[PDB]
Ligand binder design. Structure first.
Ligand SMILES: Nc1ncnc2c1ncn2[C@@H]1O[C@H](COP(=O)(O)OP(=O)(O)NP(=O)(O)O)[C@@H](O)[C@H]1O
Ligand SMILES: Nc1ncnc2c1ncn2[C@@H]1O[C@H](COP(=O)(O)OP(=O)(O)NP(=O)(O)O)[C@@H](O)[C@H]1O
Ligand SMILES: [Mg+2]
Ligand SMILES: [Mg+2]
Lengths: 366, 365
């Protein structure tokens, strides 16, 4: 299904930081349409999105919680997953824009990721029948300085236990990680425990912009297979489908002029910005492709893109969520983010469902 | 006039081999018997007029012991009673189960007891006062091209392994000098003497087993039919007889695998020589069975030399190859069936039986 990507946006409000150092509002939501006032009051930029939420305030219409945003954005992808489609959602934006606060959220207001996860487990409960057997697995890993590390591993005891892995490209199913310890899911409780361990061990750190920053890229994969009956008088349960869900928490530019730092700090920031740039180029060429343009896609210019190839494009029903700030202090960043997103709507891939009727005759009969 | 039937009796797995969960390599398709390489390097097929598949009770066409007897061994009882000589060969490697087919078990008999008691009972069919019947038997072994009588009990001496010699009767055919005979009317007494016989038989503990056959054994039965006829006077002297010759051949064995020394190697050499000779002989007999005129090297060994008349002319015979199905002795099985086949061995290679599901070809067409 040559089909597009759902692009959603969430303007978080200002903070103690702006209260201490006054930073006016410039982002404005006409219900859902995004409008940004230049502090010079010379231009208003405006952007239109398939989805909007106005978390700037709780009161005016357009407001939405984590789960409102879920049932707007991610529950449909749950639907397409049970339809059998691979699915993607990934975040974008700067530091302190609640990109984690949205996707993952915290303990008290967890994000789209945990909402979807419990919805998925109970949605399997809805059809926990012998009509269709279900089997769910998940992996969870991180990207730091182009190095891949396993979030679900209890590290050993050593001064250096951040065991790197490497990537390999199956000629058919595409990239994957060696040693990636994909584990079985019984329920959202198990998912929760896994996520807790991983987010704990993630290489994150405090800084001058936020108390805790996602200095590494995080990937959270689920794959649900569902074995169903075929339409034959013989072995009926010989049909199966798979659906691969991919939820991605990226990092922010973290411009060093404000993110004054040194050593390993600046190193991580450099690698991050490099990665995100590569991603942006991927996104742009994808948009041009969706415009019908014959274009070479530098998936291979980094690791993030390479792994997420089949999700940024390929075969999956996908979405992006962009996080943006109201403070004029970072209006440039928010504008860049909004332009990224409004370009992002234009992207399409060709999404179907992964029966994998291999050595089955079912697809051939079909 | 003679003719031979060439057949094969497949053994099933043992408790040992089932415990190993040893792979099967022998399979059948009709009388055809195939061997599949474990690495599928070669899929061979040997062909027989008959195949005795005692691999699984549940299989279509299971051959039981009496099945074998009434399939291949029994007709020879008819022909021997008819009045021409009969023989049955058994050839196979150690552990194949030659005794299991031939002698069988004390509870599950073989073609030996089946034929013996059947022929007793079947001569009792015709036990008239017009015709007299008289039955004898002899039993001897060939070993290093030496003949030894199996019916003399060893004495309290270095040995009684007294070598004997072959002479060619000017009229009838070759026979053995000094061979003591006994007369029979009971298989119980057949067995009485055999108790001595297969004890005196020379044997050796190889690696393939603890008691291997290191000497060919020939067991023949003497059937005498004396009839009287109207001659315008005293009715007397119409004589017809026949012979029934059982051949417990010995296994070949590659000396390269039987790494050893001395007398063991000598016996292996002699045995292989005999087998080769016999293979030549039998093939020649087949070619004449199709009518090819040809010279026969009967004289190249003692065994065939004795059997010459039992093999030629009006002579009905069969040979049973014994084999094991297990993947582990696959080489031995291929060897055995190769000896057994009388035209050639088929071979190919094929790893396409998996059409990935339910004959995908039916869709691809
Ligand atoms: N719209 C919002 N409404 C209420 N609270 C918010 C909102 N957005 C963010 N927050 C909170 O403010 C804090 C700032 O967000 P923060 O988690 O630092 O962004 P982030 O996703 O960490 N960016 P990065 O660290 O670069 O990945 C978070 O701890 C949230 O709990
Ligand atoms: N068709 C069969 N069904 C069941 N068991 C069999 C069959 N053929 C052989 N066996 C077993 O294998 C053995 C074959 O005869 P036996 O002489 O006892 O073993 P062996 O070592 O093969 N002796 P040999 O006759 O000299 O090969 C028997 O002891 C049986 O228990
Ligand atoms: Mg974050
Ligand atoms: Mg045996």
């Amino acid at each position: 299904f040559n089909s597009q990507v759902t692009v959603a946006v969430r303007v978080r409000p200002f903070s103690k930081r702006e209260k201490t150092e006054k930073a006016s509002q410039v982002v404005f939501t006409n219900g859902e349409e995004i409008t940004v006032e230049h502090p010079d009051m010379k231009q208003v930029y405006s952007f239109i999105y398939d989805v909007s939420f106005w978390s700037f305030d709780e009161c005016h219409p357009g407001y939405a919680s984590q789960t409102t945003v879920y049932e707007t954005l991610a529950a449909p992808l749950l639907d397409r997953a049970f339809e059998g489609y691979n699915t993607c959602l990934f975040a974008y934006g700067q530091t302190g824009s609640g990109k984690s606060y949205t996707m993952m959220g915290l303990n008290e207001e967890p994000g789209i990721i945990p909402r979807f996860c419990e919805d998925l487990f109970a949605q399997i409960a809805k059809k926990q029948t012998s009509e269709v057997s279900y089997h769910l697995e998940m992996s969870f890993f991180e990207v730091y300085n182009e190095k891949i590390h396993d979030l679900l591993v209890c590290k050993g005891e050593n001064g250096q236990r951040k065991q790197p892995l490497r990537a390999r490209e199956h000629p058919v199913s595409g990239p994957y990680v060696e040693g990636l310890s994909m584990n079985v899911v019984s329920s959202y409780s198990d998912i929760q425990s896994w996520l807790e361990l991983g987010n704990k061990q993630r290489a994150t750190a405090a800084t001058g912009m936020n108390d805790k920053s996602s200095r590494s890229h995080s990937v959270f994969t689920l794959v649900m297979t569902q074995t169903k009956t075929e339409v034959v008088e013989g072995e009926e349960h010989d049909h199966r489908i798979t659906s691969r869900i991919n939820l991605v928490d990226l990092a922010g530019s973290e411009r060093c002029s404000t993110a004054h730092s040194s050593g390993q700090r600046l190193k991580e920031g450099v690698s991050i910005n490099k990665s995100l740039l590569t991603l942006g180029k991927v996104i742009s060429a994808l948009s041009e492709q969706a415009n019908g343009k014959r274009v070479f896609i530098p998936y291979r210019e980094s690791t993030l893109t390479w792994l997420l190839k089949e999700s940024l494009g390929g075969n999956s029903k996908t979405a992006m969520i962009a996080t943006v700030s109201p403070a004029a202090s970072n209006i440039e960043e928010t504008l860049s983010t909004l332009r990224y997103a409004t370009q992002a709507r234009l992207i399409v891939n060709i999404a179907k469902v992964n029966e994998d009727m291999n050595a089955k005759l079912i697809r051939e009969l079909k």
